[PDB]
């Protein structure tokens, strides 16, 4: 999974601390 504050993938909610944000970061 991704990390909070780190640029996640605009694919889905891969963030380990929530979902991806519109700003490109979780």
Structure tokens at 13: 């909610």
Domain that holds residue 4: 1-26
Residues with Cβ within 8 Å of 12's Cβ and at least 6 positions away in sequence, in order, are 19, 20
Separation of alpha carbons 10 and 8, rounded Å: 6
Number of domains observed in the structure of the chain: 1
Separation of CA 22 from chain center:
9
Separation of alpha carbons 9 and 16, rounded Å: 12
Separation of alpha carbons 18 and 26, rounded Å: 7
């Amino acid at each position: 999974c991704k990390g909070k504050g780190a640029p996640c993938r605009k694919t889905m909610y891969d963030c380990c601390k929530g979902r991806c944000g519109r700003r490109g970061r979780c």
